[PDB]
Amino acid sequence: ELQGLLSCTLPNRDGDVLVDADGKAMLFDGRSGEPFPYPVTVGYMYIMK
Amino acid sequence: GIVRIGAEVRDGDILVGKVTPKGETELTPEERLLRAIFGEKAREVRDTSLKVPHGESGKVIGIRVFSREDEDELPAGVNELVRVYVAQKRKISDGDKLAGRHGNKGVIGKILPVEDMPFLADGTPVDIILNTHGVPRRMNIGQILET
Amino acid sequence: AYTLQELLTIKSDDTVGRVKVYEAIVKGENIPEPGIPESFKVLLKELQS
Amino acid sequence: ATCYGRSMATGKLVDIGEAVGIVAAQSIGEPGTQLTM
Amino acid sequence: WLSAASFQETTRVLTDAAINCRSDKLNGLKENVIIGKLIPAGTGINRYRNIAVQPTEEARAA
Amino acid sequence: ISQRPTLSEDVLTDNRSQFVIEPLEPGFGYTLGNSLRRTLLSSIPGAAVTSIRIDGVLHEFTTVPGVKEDVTEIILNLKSLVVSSEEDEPVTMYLRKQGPGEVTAGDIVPPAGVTVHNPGMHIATLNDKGKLEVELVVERGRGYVPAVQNRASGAEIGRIPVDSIYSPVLKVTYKVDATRRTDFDKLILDVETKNSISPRDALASAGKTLVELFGLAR
Amino acid sequence: MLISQRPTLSEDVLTDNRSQFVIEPLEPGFGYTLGNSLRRTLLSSIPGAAVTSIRIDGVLHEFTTVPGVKEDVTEIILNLKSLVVSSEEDEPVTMYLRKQGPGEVTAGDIVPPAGVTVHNPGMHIATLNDKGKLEVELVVERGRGYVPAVEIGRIPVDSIYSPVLKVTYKVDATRVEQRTDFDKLILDVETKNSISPRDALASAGKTLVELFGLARELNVEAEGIEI
Amino acid sequence: EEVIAEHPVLLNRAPTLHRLGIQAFEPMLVEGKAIQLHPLVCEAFNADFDGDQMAVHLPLSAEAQAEARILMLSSNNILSPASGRPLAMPRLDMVTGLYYLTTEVPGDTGEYQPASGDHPETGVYSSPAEAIMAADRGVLSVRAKIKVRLTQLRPPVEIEAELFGHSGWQPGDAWMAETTLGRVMFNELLPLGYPFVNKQMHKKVQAAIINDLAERYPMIVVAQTVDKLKDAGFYWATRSGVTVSMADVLVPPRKKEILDHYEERADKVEKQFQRGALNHDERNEALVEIWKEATDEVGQALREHYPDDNPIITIVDSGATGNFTQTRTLAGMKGLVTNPKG
Amino acid sequence: VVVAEESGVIEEVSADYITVMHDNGTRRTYRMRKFARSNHGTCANQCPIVDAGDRVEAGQVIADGPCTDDGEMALGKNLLVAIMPWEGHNYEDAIILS
Amino acid sequence: SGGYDTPLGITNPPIDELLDRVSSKYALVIYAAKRARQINDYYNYVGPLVEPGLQEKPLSIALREIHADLLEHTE
């Protein structure tokens, strides 16, 4: 069910689906600028202090 | 002699001023010479005032005070008692301990500027970067599913 | 050896050596020679007890 | 020093002042929490 | 006897040492640690701790 | 051979704009887009509130009678104020209000040279007994400046320092198009600022900053 | 806005064609805004002339055997790609290298046509043994950066147009007693014999000044001042 | 900042199991309230960053400061005094960073391909700077096999014996090498004198390299080489593309059939025990052996179904961290579980 | 957390207390713990989650506590996480924050 | 000079070059410590024998002197 939901991801405000069905996404290195070569798993997690 | 509500105090600042009757034995030769020359034998005290501990600062929130002149319950020989409450707004910092719900704990090594942070295609930067090598060997895959 | 002696004598127990060390560092002089740990005197007195 | 052998950390011949007894005790007892039935 | 008393079974060691009127030579790592003396190892060995240092005459001229 | 590059602006909304830079060297669009985006996110000058002052309170951790939110929650609401100031000096705004009703940014009376760009933002909710009287010192700077302490300045007990977020831009990103005998890259910046300034002004400020910085290279 | 000052630039000369440069102090986060851009500009945006394609007589189909010399065609191309040359003709210009008899051919044995200049005459090319002769054609033209291999007897080579060879940067932290987190940029550059690292750095600076002046032209507005 | 310069401090973390639990460092003033600790000394301290605290002692006397700078300095103690193995060696992240950096991918972009017809090879490069230029452009991959002429690197024993005079080499001597740009850049960290490796850098290989460096080269050379290795390993671990997702944790495809088969075996064992033929302890031992076999079969099936570039397999097999039983437990089957008696 | 003991309409809401008016005419008032120190130094602070005039049922949450958000235990924050090694600043269980 | 790169102020002179001056690391420690407190006695007794830094720890000065072989020692 999680695998299926990873495909139904609604786009953002610009119509782009930022996260693919593997849960990964292409990120850009904010220091150099070149995009990171491989897709990296991104998402939202509950973090405590 | 009490700090004022709302004041900002730092390490070593005085919160409540207190003076204690000074023991005659510990009078240094210089103090003895002065008290014998001028004869100022009036209201002899020493500084035992409350101070702020090391590594502690913040805004003073409230002050509660109980006196013996006013009818309050205090232990034997205690004339006055004053509590001062100090609050601090602690932002997240290096070395502070974060953790998820799956046993994945960690302290904060570096907080990068929002530009140094890797960002998605539309420019949304990530908020926290968890290393990969930690995940598979602890046997908490629930964090990946939660993500 | 000198580190271990400094840790156990002039940093912990020497009552005349710690003040001497502070006085020597304040005036920029060399560190003096350590003395006798006071806890050893306490051990001797407790053995006498 | 000659009968003992080289020093593991330095790789050269063990110096004189070295206290090899405590080093040996530490070396034997440090991976002690790894022995299981 | 000091090392044995600090290690384990202090009461028995102390009784036995008092009966035999034991005099500790006071030359051991733990002994020198307890009494606050330089330990007989490493930089505490006589040949290392009593080294004399002075510049050479050729360098003392310059 | 090298054709002189051009910068052509597109517009999506009043606060968001796409820019197109072309032609560029192959593999050169990513680096330029990043060197622009970093300066856009970090060092764009703007204006924000530095310290506030409420009459009935002497510190941040208390409650104003009648209002619904505590002073700390009120400050967290004021953290969302987008303002623009031409004075470039400490200038004081005022706000008097009495309930019932609700206090918003439109109820604040800004002095000359400054203006609030979202009057509809919620600040506090007042009742019959609620009375809100606030002064807000507004200044102009860049980046993020944490609350200036009352020990650093000659401030007094009533002054409540607040965090200052001087960034006028909201979200910056970029994308490149590579084209492979004649290879070249076309860069597309996407800049969304707050209603304080237009993306044209933000990108112009970043361009001047980077020109001034690279001028020492020659 | 605000005012920043004292962003000095200094140089350490290791060799005549290689030097380090230090930009300090830079504001927080600006060590990486300048670092990658300067490197990519030095590498890919500088005008320079180099070899594009060549033709070697004697053997054309085998492409691996050549009489008179022991070096293969691969090593010949390797020796040729490292030849530094500067041309001002926009059109591709052909040069020729001819040498007979046993001996050693250098880059000075080449006859440069009008306009072009070879800067490494002492560079080794090939060695002719007994009864050997070498006659080769070269195509030299201008460009920027680096481009891979793009009439019988013709072979294209890898054109190294960039007058710089190797550029690498690093970022450290030195600042005032209030921040201690400002950035310092260290840029190690190693160039060819065409231009010194100084002139390459100045050219990259001018090209980037033009690039970002394209954006500054949109409006004359406030930004960080300098001293 | 003036009084701190060249005044070493002692860092200790309990439990101090061996003498490396206390080490001398040069203090550098940092912002914050945390002690920044070099990532290589962790193996000596058994220190992770899950909330660990360390203590700092300040030597005062000249003899104590000398003992700190000489006897207890961090860069002086690189080898375990127990087995002589390297402890300041790249540990886990760095490992992957180097394991990805030196492995050769057959058929990558820019890979050397022989000349066919009128098309040249385009697999040779004059200098490693030319390879760096070809890598900045999208043509050359770092993990692709190419042929480079190396002027500032030392060749192996056989290549130096064939092409050059044995024990004779000079900086600037040229030689052809068919390697990856990654292996070139990795050998660039190792000193000039060290022979080229051209091997996939499993953790054991770098352990052997550091053993050789400590056996032959000075201690300070090793202390700088390990720092260069740390930097390279981290930089390339960022770009090694190792993450974790639910799709990267692949369930074995034949798990259902294997479990059905071995549970059928166990059911036959239970049927045999139902008639009283099989002994109780014999039944327990038989079921234990059955489920051990099934666990290992599921592990083998998982090892077969997993690509060799999977991030889990890459992390485990590179020697960075973890073992294969953890992977068998994560995806596949954990197996038998302990009892109160054992 | 603050829970309604009896159904009714909220009569007044302040940062200090919440006064509700039951259906039988009786009043009730709940005082808010504001910036109260805990046994371990954490801050116990309560904030009303209802507005004046709302009709609440018996047992509804009227004000949130320290780690409560509209009625549920909110012990932390939802953060955008990317899982990748980054320049060793997340080496060995260290964490990198934006 | 050797293949080692430039040390960084506290790791110089390299320990591999200083251990060639004495028989053991302990003797080197005592060597440097006695020379250093002798130096500090001079400032309040001979030396420094090399050019001192603008502000330098006397231990580092003694280490540089030992590296320069400008002094003798006897066990």
Ligand SMILES: [Mg+2]
């Ligand atoms: Mg731990």
